Amino acid sequence: TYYPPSSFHFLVEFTGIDAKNNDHEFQSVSGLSVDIDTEEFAEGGENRFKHKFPVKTKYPNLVLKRGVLVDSKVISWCRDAIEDFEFKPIDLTVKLLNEEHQPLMTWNVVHAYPVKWSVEDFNAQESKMAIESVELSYNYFKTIV
């Protein structure tokens, strides 16, 4: 913009999981990008370049981090998939906020489910917070702005 916005003020909301204020707060969000797979072809007589063709649109997994929370609803949902193969996809909204705490821009993440859950190593000789990490697979996203 004339002065572009910073990246440290944002909100993560879930649809299909009971809401709690402690499940909307995260330390970091990553994975909001996309790419197109292509193929190459050489045409006889054309020596200046090879041709390139698109094939598929590709998205990476969405990664969320925060300090450990013991009564999380999101984690209970993750456990049902992890332990029993019960899968029930959800939708999600990522919001980048302005100074009035209203959205500048949002991302609509469609049909997501859990593929990973972990907690970082313990160390008796270091002063650190216990950090939790969750990774989700989804089909695509759209933006609103």
Binding site: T15, D91, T93, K95, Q102, P103, T106, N108, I144
Partner: protein, 49 residues
């Protein structure tokens, strides 16, 4: 049919604050319902627009 399904989907926002952070969530949800109906062959049009 379509109206009944949307009506049920919006019940979850009835007692939410009336501001931009709700308006955006209501829109995203309705659009997701409709895009599925479009892919299914109920709605006309080359692309969602």
């Amino acid at each position: 049919m379509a109206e009944e399904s949307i009506k049920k989907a919006t019940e979850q926002f009835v007692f939410e604050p009336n501001d931009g952070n709700t308006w955006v969530r209501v829109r995203a949800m309705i659009e997701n319902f409709l895009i599925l109906q479009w892919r299914a062959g109920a709605l006309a049009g080359a692309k969602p627009e």
